[PDB]
Coordinates of C-alpha atoms and ligand atoms in Angstrom, one line a residue:
Chain A
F187 CA -18.3 -119.2 24.5
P188 CA -18.0 -116.5 27.2
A189 CA -18.1 -112.8 26.6
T190 CA -15.0 -110.7 26.2
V191 CA -14.6 -107.1 25.3
Chain B
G41 CA 4.8 -99.3 4.8
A42 CA 1.8 -98.6 2.6
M43 CA 0.4 -95.8 4.8
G44 CA 3.8 -93.9 5.0
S45 CA 2.6 -91.2 2.5
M46 CA -0.8 -90.5 4.1
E47 CA -1.4 -87.7 6.6
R48 CA -1.9 -88.9 10.3
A49 CA -5.3 -87.0 10.4
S50 CA -6.3 -88.6 7.1
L51 CA -5.6 -92.1 8.5
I52 CA -7.8 -91.5 11.5
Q53 CA -10.5 -90.0 9.4
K54 CA -10.4 -93.0 7.0
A55 CA -10.4 -95.5 9.9
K56 CA -13.7 -93.9 11.1
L57 CA -15.1 -94.2 7.6
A58 CA -14.0 -97.8 7.4
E59 CA -15.7 -98.4 10.8
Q60 CA -19.0 -97.1 9.5
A61 CA -18.7 -99.2 6.4
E62 CA -17.7 -102.3 8.6
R63 CA -14.5 -102.6 6.6
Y64 CA -12.4 -103.8 9.5
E65 CA -9.3 -104.9 7.6
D66 CA -9.0 -101.4 6.0
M67 CA -9.8 -100.0 9.4
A68 CA -6.9 -102.0 11.0
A69 CA -4.5 -100.9 8.2
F70 CA -5.3 -97.2 8.6
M71 CA -4.8 -97.4 12.4
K72 CA -1.5 -99.4 11.9
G73 CA -0.5 -96.5 9.6
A74 CA -1.5 -94.0 12.3
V75 CA 0.4 -95.8 15.0
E76 CA 3.5 -95.9 12.8
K77 CA 3.6 -92.1 12.7
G78 CA 5.3 -92.4 16.0
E79 CA 2.9 -90.1 18.0
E80 CA 0.9 -91.4 21.0
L81 CA -2.8 -92.2 20.3
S82 CA -5.6 -90.3 22.1
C83 CA -8.4 -92.1 24.0
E84 CA -10.7 -92.1 20.9
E85 CA -7.8 -93.3 18.6
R86 CA -7.0 -96.1 21.0
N87 CA -10.6 -97.3 20.7
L88 CA -10.4 -97.3 16.8
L89 CA -7.2 -99.4 16.9
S90 CA -8.6 -102.0 19.3
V91 CA -12.0 -102.3 17.6
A92 CA -10.4 -102.7 14.2
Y93 CA -8.1 -105.6 15.2
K94 CA -10.7 -107.2 17.6
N95 CA -13.0 -107.5 14.6
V96 CA -10.4 -108.7 12.1
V97 CA -9.1 -111.4 14.5
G98 CA -12.6 -112.1 15.7
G99 CA -13.6 -113.4 12.2
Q100 CA -10.4 -115.4 11.9
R101 CA -11.1 -117.1 15.3
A102 CA -14.7 -117.9 14.3
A103 CA -13.4 -119.4 11.0
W104 CA -10.6 -121.3 12.8
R105 CA -13.0 -122.8 15.2
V106 CA -15.4 -124.0 12.4
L107 CA -12.4 -125.6 10.7
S108 CA -10.8 -127.1 13.8
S109 CA -14.1 -128.6 14.8
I110 CA -14.4 -130.2 11.3
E111 CA -10.9 -131.4 11.6
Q112 CA -11.4 -133.0 15.1
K113 CA -14.6 -134.7 13.7
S114 CA -12.5 -136.3 10.9
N115 CA -10.2 -137.8 13.6
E116 CA -13.0 -139.7 15.4
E117 CA -13.3 -143.6 15.3
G118 CA -15.1 -144.5 12.0
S119 CA -14.8 -141.0 10.3
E120 CA -13.9 -141.3 6.6
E121 CA -10.3 -140.3 5.9
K122 CA -10.7 -137.1 3.8
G123 CA -7.0 -136.4 3.0
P124 CA -4.8 -133.5 4.0
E125 CA -7.2 -130.7 2.9
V126 CA -8.9 -129.9 6.2
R127 CA -5.6 -129.7 8.1
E128 CA -4.1 -127.6 5.3
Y129 CA -6.9 -125.1 5.2
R130 CA -7.1 -124.9 9.0
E131 CA -3.3 -124.2 9.1
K132 CA -3.7 -121.5 6.4
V133 CA -6.4 -119.7 8.5
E134 CA -4.4 -120.3 11.6
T135 CA -1.1 -118.8 10.2
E136 CA -3.0 -115.8 8.9
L137 CA -4.6 -115.4 12.5
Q138 CA -1.1 -115.7 14.0
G139 CA 0.4 -113.0 11.7
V140 CA -2.3 -110.6 12.7
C141 CA -1.6 -111.2 16.4
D142 CA 2.1 -110.8 15.7
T143 CA 1.4 -107.5 13.9
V144 CA -0.7 -106.1 16.9
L145 CA 1.9 -107.2 19.4
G146 CA 4.7 -105.6 17.3
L147 CA 2.7 -102.3 17.4
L148 CA 2.3 -102.6 21.2
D149 CA 6.0 -103.4 21.5
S150 CA 7.1 -100.6 19.0
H151 CA 6.3 -98.2 20.8
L152 CA 2.8 -97.9 22.3
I153 CA 3.4 -99.6 25.7
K154 CA 6.8 -98.0 26.4
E155 CA 5.5 -94.4 25.7
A156 CA 2.2 -94.9 27.6
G157 CA 2.6 -93.0 30.9
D158 CA -1.1 -92.4 32.0
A159 CA -2.9 -95.4 33.6
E160 CA -5.8 -95.4 31.1
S161 CA -3.4 -95.7 28.1
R162 CA -1.0 -98.1 29.9
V163 CA -3.7 -100.4 31.1
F164 CA -5.5 -100.3 27.7
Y165 CA -2.3 -101.4 25.8
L166 CA -1.4 -104.1 28.4
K167 CA -4.9 -105.5 28.1
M168 CA -4.6 -105.7 24.2
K169 CA -1.2 -107.4 24.8
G170 CA -2.9 -110.0 27.1
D171 CA -5.8 -110.5 24.5
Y172 CA -3.5 -111.1 21.5
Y173 CA -1.2 -113.5 23.4
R174 CA -4.5 -115.2 24.5
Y175 CA -5.6 -115.5 20.8
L176 CA -2.3 -117.1 20.1
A177 CA -2.7 -119.5 23.1
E178 CA -6.1 -120.6 21.7
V179 CA -4.4 -122.1 18.6
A180 CA -1.0 -123.0 20.3
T181 CA -0.1 -126.6 20.1
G182 CA 3.6 -127.3 20.5
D183 CA 6.4 -126.1 22.8
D184 CA 5.4 -122.5 22.7
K185 CA 2.0 -123.1 24.3
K186 CA 3.2 -122.7 28.0
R187 CA 5.3 -119.6 27.2
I188 CA 2.5 -117.9 25.2
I189 CA 0.0 -118.5 28.1
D190 CA 2.5 -117.0 30.5
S191 CA 3.0 -113.9 28.3
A192 CA -0.7 -113.4 28.3
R193 CA -1.0 -113.9 32.1
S194 CA 2.0 -111.6 32.7
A195 CA 0.6 -108.8 30.5
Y196 CA -2.9 -109.1 32.1
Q197 CA -1.4 -109.1 35.6
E198 CA 0.7 -106.0 35.1
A199 CA -2.5 -104.2 33.7
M200 CA -4.5 -105.4 36.7
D201 CA -1.9 -104.2 39.3
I202 CA -2.0 -100.7 37.6
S203 CA -5.7 -100.6 37.2
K204 CA -6.2 -101.4 40.8
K205 CA -3.8 -98.7 41.9
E206 CA -4.9 -95.9 39.5
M207 CA -8.6 -96.4 38.4
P208 CA -12.0 -96.5 40.1
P209 CA -13.7 -99.9 40.1
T210 CA -16.3 -98.8 37.5
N211 CA -13.7 -97.6 35.0
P212 CA -14.7 -99.3 31.7
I213 CA -11.1 -100.3 30.8
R214 CA -10.5 -101.7 34.3
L215 CA -13.8 -103.6 34.0
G216 CA -13.1 -104.9 30.5
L217 CA -9.6 -106.1 31.5
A218 CA -11.1 -108.0 34.5
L219 CA -13.8 -109.6 32.2
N220 CA -11.1 -110.7 29.7
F221 CA -8.5 -111.9 32.3
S222 CA -11.3 -113.8 34.0
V223 CA -12.0 -115.5 30.5
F224 CA -8.3 -116.3 30.2
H225 CA -8.4 -118.1 33.6
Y226 CA -11.5 -120.1 32.6
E227 CA -10.7 -121.0 28.9
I228 CA -6.9 -120.9 28.7
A229 CA -5.3 -121.3 32.2
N230 CA -7.5 -124.2 33.3
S231 CA -8.4 -122.1 36.5
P232 CA -12.3 -121.9 36.5
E233 CA -12.2 -121.0 40.2
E234 CA -9.8 -118.0 39.7
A235 CA -12.1 -117.0 36.8
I236 CA -15.3 -117.0 38.9
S237 CA -13.6 -115.2 41.9
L238 CA -12.3 -112.5 39.7
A239 CA -15.6 -111.8 37.8
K240 CA -17.5 -111.8 41.2
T241 CA -15.3 -109.4 43.1
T242 CA -15.0 -107.3 40.0
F243 CA -18.8 -107.1 39.7
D244 CA -19.3 -106.5 43.4
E245 CA -16.7 -103.7 43.7
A246 CA -18.1 -101.9 40.6
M247 CA -21.7 -102.2 42.1
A248 CA -20.6 -100.4 45.2
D249 CA -19.0 -97.6 43.1
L250 CA -22.0 -96.9 40.9
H251 CA -23.3 -94.2 43.3
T252 CA -20.3 -91.9 42.5
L253 CA -21.3 -91.9 38.7
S254 CA -23.3 -89.5 36.5
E255 CA -26.4 -91.1 35.1
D256 CA -25.2 -92.1 32.6
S257 CA -21.8 -91.2 31.1
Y258 CA -21.1 -94.9 32.0
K259 CA -23.1 -97.0 29.4
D260 CA -19.9 -98.9 28.5
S261 CA -19.4 -99.8 32.2
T262 CA -23.0 -100.9 32.6
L263 CA -22.6 -103.1 29.5
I264 CA -19.4 -104.7 30.8
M265 CA -20.9 -105.4 34.3
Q266 CA -23.7 -107.3 32.4
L267 CA -21.1 -109.4 30.6
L268 CA -19.5 -110.2 33.9
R269 CA -22.9 -111.3 35.1
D270 CA -23.6 -113.4 32.0
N271 CA -20.2 -115.1 32.3
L272 CA -20.9 -115.9 36.1
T273 CA -24.3 -117.3 35.0
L274 CA -22.6 -119.5 32.4
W275 CA -20.1 -120.7 34.9
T276 CA -22.1 -121.2 38.0
Chain C
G265 CA -1.9 -118.3 -10.5
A266 CA -1.6 -119.2 -6.8
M267 CA -3.9 -122.2 -7.1
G268 CA -2.0 -123.8 -10.1
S269 CA -0.3 -126.4 -7.9
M270 CA -3.5 -127.5 -6.0
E271 CA -5.6 -130.5 -7.1
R272 CA -9.0 -129.6 -8.7
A273 CA -10.8 -131.9 -6.2
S274 CA -8.8 -130.3 -3.4
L275 CA -9.9 -126.7 -4.5
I276 CA -13.6 -127.8 -4.6
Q277 CA -13.2 -129.5 -1.2
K278 CA -11.6 -126.3 0.3
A279 CA -14.2 -124.0 -1.2
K280 CA -16.9 -126.0 0.6
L281 CA -14.8 -125.7 3.9
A282 CA -14.5 -121.9 3.3
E283 CA -18.3 -121.7 2.7
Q284 CA -18.9 -123.4 6.1
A285 CA -16.5 -121.0 7.7
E286 CA -18.0 -118.0 5.9
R287 CA -14.6 -117.3 4.5
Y288 CA -15.9 -116.0 1.1
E289 CA -12.7 -114.4 -0.2
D290 CA -10.9 -117.8 0.2
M291 CA -13.9 -119.5 -1.2
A292 CA -13.8 -117.3 -4.4
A293 CA -10.1 -117.9 -4.8
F294 CA -10.4 -121.6 -4.5
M295 CA -13.3 -121.6 -7.1
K296 CA -11.2 -119.3 -9.4
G297 CA -8.4 -121.9 -9.1
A298 CA -10.9 -124.7 -9.9
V299 CA -12.3 -122.8 -13.0
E300 CA -8.7 -122.2 -14.2
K301 CA -8.1 -126.0 -14.5
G302 CA -10.0 -125.7 -17.7
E303 CA -12.7 -128.3 -17.1
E304 CA -16.5 -127.5 -17.1
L305 CA -18.1 -127.1 -13.6
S306 CA -20.9 -129.4 -12.4
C307 CA -24.2 -128.0 -11.1
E308 CA -22.9 -128.1 -7.5
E309 CA -19.6 -126.4 -8.4
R310 CA -21.4 -123.6 -10.3
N311 CA -23.3 -122.8 -7.2
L312 CA -20.1 -122.6 -5.1
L313 CA -18.5 -120.2 -7.6
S314 CA -21.6 -117.9 -7.7
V315 CA -22.2 -117.9 -4.0
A316 CA -18.5 -117.1 -3.3
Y317 CA -18.4 -114.0 -5.5
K318 CA -21.9 -112.9 -4.7
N319 CA -20.8 -112.7 -1.1
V320 CA -17.5 -111.0 -1.8
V321 CA -19.0 -108.3 -4.1
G322 CA -22.1 -108.1 -1.8
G323 CA -19.9 -106.8 1.1
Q324 CA -18.0 -104.4 -1.3
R325 CA -21.3 -103.0 -2.5
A326 CA -22.7 -102.5 1.0
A327 CA -19.4 -100.7 2.0
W328 CA -19.5 -98.6 -1.3
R329 CA -23.1 -97.5 -0.6
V330 CA -22.2 -96.4 3.0
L331 CA -19.3 -94.4 1.7
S332 CA -21.1 -92.9 -1.3
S333 CA -23.9 -91.9 0.9
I334 CA -21.4 -90.1 3.3
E335 CA -19.8 -88.5 0.2
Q336 CA -23.2 -87.2 -1.2
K337 CA -24.0 -85.8 2.2
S338 CA -20.7 -83.8 2.2
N339 CA -21.7 -82.2 -1.1
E340 CA -25.0 -80.7 0.3
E341 CA -25.5 -76.9 0.8
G342 CA -24.0 -76.0 4.2
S343 CA -22.1 -79.3 4.7
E344 CA -18.6 -78.7 6.1
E345 CA -15.8 -79.3 3.6
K346 CA -14.0 -82.4 4.9
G347 CA -11.1 -82.6 2.3
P348 CA -10.4 -85.4 -0.2
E349 CA -10.6 -88.3 2.2
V350 CA -14.1 -89.5 1.7
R351 CA -13.8 -89.5 -2.1
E352 CA -10.4 -91.2 -1.9
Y353 CA -11.7 -93.9 0.3
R354 CA -14.9 -94.4 -1.7
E355 CA -12.7 -94.7 -4.9
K356 CA -10.5 -97.2 -3.2
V357 CA -13.5 -99.5 -2.3
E358 CA -14.9 -98.9 -5.7
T359 CA -11.8 -99.9 -7.6
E360 CA -11.4 -103.0 -5.5
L361 CA -15.2 -103.8 -6.3
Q362 CA -14.5 -103.2 -10.1
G363 CA -11.5 -105.5 -10.0
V364 CA -13.6 -108.3 -8.5
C365 CA -16.2 -107.8 -11.2
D366 CA -13.5 -107.8 -13.9
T367 CA -12.1 -111.0 -12.4
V368 CA -15.6 -112.8 -12.5
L369 CA -16.3 -111.6 -16.1
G370 CA -12.8 -112.7 -17.3
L371 CA -13.7 -116.2 -15.9
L372 CA -17.0 -116.2 -17.6
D373 CA -15.3 -115.1 -20.8
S374 CA -12.3 -117.6 -20.4
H375 CA -13.9 -120.1 -21.0
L376 CA -17.1 -120.9 -19.0
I377 CA -19.8 -119.3 -21.3
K378 CA -18.2 -120.6 -24.6
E379 CA -17.9 -124.3 -23.4
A380 CA -21.5 -124.2 -21.7
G381 CA -23.8 -126.2 -24.0
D382 CA -26.6 -127.3 -21.7
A383 CA -29.3 -124.7 -21.0
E384 CA -28.9 -124.8 -17.2
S385 CA -25.1 -124.0 -17.3
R386 CA -25.5 -121.5 -20.2
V387 CA -28.3 -119.6 -18.6
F388 CA -26.5 -119.7 -15.2
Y389 CA -23.2 -118.2 -16.6
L390 CA -25.2 -115.5 -18.7
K391 CA -27.1 -114.5 -15.6
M392 CA -23.8 -114.1 -13.6
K393 CA -22.5 -112.1 -16.6
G394 CA -25.6 -109.8 -16.4
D395 CA -25.2 -109.4 -12.6
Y396 CA -21.5 -108.5 -12.7
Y397 CA -22.0 -105.9 -15.4
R398 CA -25.0 -104.6 -13.3
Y399 CA -22.6 -104.2 -10.3
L400 CA -20.3 -102.3 -12.5
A401 CA -23.2 -100.1 -13.7
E402 CA -24.1 -99.3 -10.1
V403 CA -20.9 -97.4 -9.7
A404 CA -20.4 -96.3 -13.3
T405 CA -20.2 -92.6 -13.7
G406 CA -18.4 -91.6 -16.9
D407 CA -18.6 -92.5 -20.6
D408 CA -18.7 -96.2 -19.9
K409 CA -22.0 -96.1 -18.0
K410 CA -24.2 -96.6 -21.2
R411 CA -22.1 -99.4 -22.6
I412 CA -21.9 -101.3 -19.3
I413 CA -25.7 -101.1 -18.8
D414 CA -26.1 -102.4 -22.3
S415 CA -23.6 -105.4 -21.7
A416 CA -25.7 -106.2 -18.7
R417 CA -29.0 -106.0 -20.6
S418 CA -27.5 -107.9 -23.5
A419 CA -26.3 -110.8 -21.3
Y420 CA -29.6 -111.0 -19.3
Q421 CA -31.6 -111.0 -22.5
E422 CA -29.7 -113.8 -24.1
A423 CA -30.1 -115.8 -20.8
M424 CA -33.9 -115.0 -20.9
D425 CA -34.3 -116.2 -24.5
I426 CA -32.6 -119.5 -23.7
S427 CA -34.4 -120.0 -20.4
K428 CA -37.8 -119.4 -22.1
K429 CA -37.0 -122.0 -24.8
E430 CA -35.3 -124.7 -22.6
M431 CA -36.6 -124.5 -19.0
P432 CA -39.9 -124.9 -17.2
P433 CA -41.2 -121.7 -15.6
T434 CA -40.4 -123.0 -12.1
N435 CA -36.8 -123.7 -12.8
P436 CA -34.8 -121.9 -10.0
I437 CA -32.2 -120.5 -12.4
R438 CA -34.9 -119.3 -14.8
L439 CA -36.7 -117.8 -11.8
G440 CA -33.6 -116.1 -10.3
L441 CA -32.6 -114.6 -13.7
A442 CA -36.0 -113.1 -14.1
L443 CA -35.9 -111.7 -10.5
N444 CA -32.5 -110.1 -11.2
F445 CA -33.2 -108.8 -14.7
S446 CA -36.4 -107.3 -13.3
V447 CA -34.2 -105.5 -10.6
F448 CA -31.9 -104.3 -13.4
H449 CA -34.9 -102.8 -15.1
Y450 CA -36.0 -101.0 -12.0
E451 CA -32.7 -99.8 -10.4
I452 CA -30.4 -99.5 -13.4
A453 CA -32.3 -99.1 -16.7
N454 CA -34.8 -96.6 -15.3
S455 CA -37.7 -98.9 -16.6
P456 CA -39.9 -99.6 -13.5
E457 CA -42.8 -100.7 -15.8
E458 CA -40.7 -103.3 -17.5
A459 CA -39.5 -104.4 -14.0
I460 CA -43.0 -104.9 -12.7
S461 CA -44.3 -106.6 -15.8
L462 CA -41.5 -109.0 -15.8
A463 CA -41.8 -110.0 -12.1
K464 CA -45.6 -110.4 -12.4
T465 CA -45.6 -112.6 -15.5
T466 CA -42.7 -114.6 -14.1
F467 CA -44.5 -115.1 -10.8
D468 CA -47.8 -116.0 -12.6
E469 CA -46.3 -118.5 -15.0
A470 CA -44.4 -120.2 -12.2
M471 CA -47.6 -120.4 -10.1
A472 CA -49.4 -122.3 -12.9
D473 CA -46.5 -124.7 -13.1
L474 CA -46.3 -125.7 -9.4
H475 CA -48.7 -128.6 -10.0
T476 CA -46.0 -130.5 -12.0
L477 CA -43.5 -130.4 -9.1
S478 CA -42.6 -132.9 -6.3
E479 CA -43.4 -131.5 -2.9
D480 CA -40.7 -130.3 -2.4
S481 CA -37.6 -130.7 -4.3
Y482 CA -38.2 -127.0 -5.1
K483 CA -37.4 -125.0 -2.0
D484 CA -35.1 -122.7 -3.9
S485 CA -38.0 -122.0 -6.4
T486 CA -40.5 -121.3 -3.6
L487 CA -38.0 -118.9 -2.0
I488 CA -37.4 -117.0 -5.3
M489 CA -41.2 -116.7 -6.1
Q490 CA -41.4 -115.1 -2.7
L491 CA -38.7 -112.6 -3.5
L492 CA -40.6 -111.8 -6.8
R493 CA -43.6 -111.1 -4.6
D494 CA -41.7 -109.0 -2.1
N495 CA -40.2 -106.9 -5.0
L496 CA -43.8 -106.5 -6.5
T497 CA -45.0 -105.3 -3.0
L498 CA -42.1 -102.8 -2.7
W499 CA -42.9 -101.5 -6.2
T500 CA -46.6 -101.4 -6.4
Chain D
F207 CA -33.3 -102.2 -1.8
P208 CA -35.0 -105.0 -3.7
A209 CA -34.1 -108.6 -3.6
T210 CA -31.8 -110.3 -5.9
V211 CA -30.4 -113.9 -5.9
Ligands
LIG847 C1 -14.9 -97.7 17.5 C2 -15.5 -96.5 17.8 C3 -16.8 -96.4 18.3 C4 -17.8 -97.5 17.8 C5 -17.3 -95.0 18.0 O1 -16.6 -96.5 19.8 C6 -16.7 -97.9 20.4 C7 -17.0 -97.6 21.9 O2 -15.9 -96.9 22.4 C8 -15.9 -96.7 23.8 O3 -16.2 -97.9 24.6 C9 -15.1 -98.7 24.8 C10 -15.4 -100.1 24.1 C11 -16.4 -100.9 24.2 C12 -17.7 -100.7 25.1 C13 -17.8 -101.7 26.3 C14 -18.9 -100.7 24.2 O4 -19.9 -100.0 25.0 C15 -21.1 -99.7 24.5 C16 -22.3 -99.2 25.4 O5 -21.3 -100.0 23.3 C17 -16.2 -102.2 23.3 C18 -15.2 -101.6 22.3 O6 -14.5 -102.6 21.6 C19 -14.3 -100.7 23.2 C20 -13.5 -99.7 22.4 C21 -13.4 -101.5 23.9 C22 -13.0 -101.7 25.2 C23 -11.9 -102.7 25.7 C24 -10.6 -102.3 24.9 O7 -9.5 -103.1 25.5 C25 -8.2 -102.7 25.0 C26 -11.7 -102.4 27.2 C27 -13.2 -102.0 27.7 C28 -13.8 -101.2 26.5 C29 -13.7 -99.7 26.8 C30 -12.4 -99.0 26.1 C31 -15.0 -98.9 26.4 O8 -14.9 -97.6 26.9 C32 -17.1 -95.8 24.1 O9 -17.1 -95.4 25.5 C33 -18.4 -96.5 23.6 O10 -19.4 -95.4 23.6 C34 -20.4 -95.6 24.5 C35 -21.7 -94.7 24.3 O11 -20.3 -96.5 25.4 C36 -18.3 -96.8 22.1 O12 -19.4 -97.6 21.7
LIG848 C1 -23.2 -122.7 -1.8 C2 -23.6 -124.0 -1.5 C3 -24.8 -124.3 -0.8 C4 -25.0 -123.3 0.4 C5 -24.7 -125.7 -0.3 O1 -25.9 -124.2 -1.8 C6 -26.6 -122.9 -2.0 C7 -27.9 -123.3 -2.6 O2 -27.7 -123.9 -3.9 C8 -28.8 -124.2 -4.7 O3 -29.7 -123.1 -4.8 C9 -29.4 -122.2 -5.8 C10 -29.1 -120.8 -5.1 C11 -29.9 -120.1 -4.2 C12 -31.3 -120.5 -3.7 C13 -32.4 -119.6 -4.2 C14 -31.3 -120.6 -2.2 O4 -32.5 -121.5 -1.9 C15 -32.7 -121.8 -0.6 C16 -34.0 -122.6 -0.2 O5 -31.8 -121.5 0.2 C17 -29.2 -118.8 -3.8 C18 -27.7 -119.2 -4.1 O6 -26.9 -118.1 -4.2 C19 -27.9 -120.0 -5.4 C20 -26.6 -120.9 -5.6 C21 -28.0 -119.2 -6.5 C22 -28.9 -119.0 -7.5 C23 -28.7 -118.0 -8.7 C24 -27.4 -118.1 -9.3 O7 -27.3 -117.3 -10.5 C25 -26.1 -117.4 -11.3 C26 -29.8 -118.3 -9.7 C27 -31.0 -118.8 -8.8 C28 -30.3 -119.7 -7.7 C29 -30.3 -121.2 -8.0 C30 -28.9 -121.7 -8.7 C31 -30.6 -122.1 -6.8 O8 -30.8 -123.4 -7.2 C32 -29.6 -125.2 -3.9 O9 -30.7 -125.7 -4.7 C33 -30.1 -124.7 -2.5 O10 -30.5 -125.8 -1.7 C34 -31.8 -125.8 -1.4 C35 -32.2 -126.9 -0.3 O11 -32.6 -125.0 -2.0 C36 -28.8 -124.2 -1.8 O12 -29.1 -123.6 -0.5

């Protein structure tokens, strides 16, 4: 899972 | 609804209490009350709104992925037939997730986006709109899947065009939008190349703009450039 | 209520899904449904029930303590008068906490304790009864405070007398009851000496009984003896 | 805060 903000 | 009799300043005050207590569902309901007063939100209030819902839908998404994973496992060759329960409970979480996304989108649509004239508020609300459609795309399965993915892309794209015209490359909202649109490309739109190209040029243009910044009123920007780099490292 | 149309085995199955997804409120509602079928719970089912509510009320207690701490701060000499909001929001969390404790206690009272004839189920339900009254004592403030503390002590004491008669000193339920009753003495009943004496003799009698155990079907017991030791280290 | 189970 990649980072989001 | 339920917040109609509470003072606007009392809703904002309670949302900040709920944040400190990590009570995100209460936090989201206070902020929904505050939005429904019909006044614009300040920069600090926007942040409360987005944090509250990010956290509520974040826990729903984590639960949905546990259940969906269990469910896919029970559909493999030689898996014991466990009955309707896993699908039922997955659909329950999923429909609660979708209702929260519909609630956020209804707030954006009535009337946050339309009254947002400054770039920072407009971009911020369009980003949220992109994210919530994206959350809906993650679970979308039938006819609607294409249309939902397109509403996400369309909201993100409009936020990108404005952010590029009106904000410096190190603006934390501009940076967080690019991070998230870039994840959309990778995980939803099946466009890993567009994802990588966007995070890279985002990261590089922000690097080249650090010299204009005070050292540091830009901790949020630093943090986001790091997440762009972590995504690039996962992907390349 | 809402679980009246679902199969008992489907409630237990969904509670285990909800546990894996860390969805404790759903987990507690499935287990309340299961209890309300009117059959006894097995050892594994008891554990699901107690974990679900421990976690729901655990997050309420953590939030209540953040808010109560804010509230006490706003009552210090020279603190700015912030209005009714902190007390209001503290009371909201507190009344939701109390309703969950009342729901657990109503389940114990209708009809888990009365139908529990084996020591392990009887002690288990009396421990839960002690804990939920204890949670109520933590927030209790008016006339009821003494009576609530006594219902806690009385439930814990009856569980202790049975556990001492019917269970070996290393039984994990017997050990967890002593841990919790001992915390009750320290934090609620203003009896730090009784707390320390109980954890010590509990720890020592369990030590002396380890030699009878398989190595290890007793991981839960090991863990609890450690928490007795950590409490003793905090307190002495 | 002391441990409980
Ligand atoms: C919810 C309120 C609190 C916890 C007080 O504020 C959350 C945070 O609020 C602001 O940070 C925002 C912000 C985040 C920062 C990247 C966090 O930065 C640090 C160093 O913690 C994540 C938050 O969710 C939030 C509000 C969201 C967004 C995101 C929203 O899209 C619609 C776009 C990028 C990012 C922007 C708005 C950041 O400015 C602040 O600039 C941060 O303060 C500092 C020192 O960086 C603060 O931690
Ligand atoms: C909720 C279900 C799951 C997570 C599957 O089970 C929780 C746990 O269920 C059992 O453990 C119980 C148990 C706990 C153990 C001390 C945890 O042990 C380990 C090594 O993780 C804490 C749990 O909340 C639970 C169910 C509760 C109690 C407590 C209840 O009072 C009314 C009294 C003491 C303790 C007893 C009942 C323990 O036996 C088991 O014996 C544990 O399994 C092992 C390997 O120790 C398992 O992790």
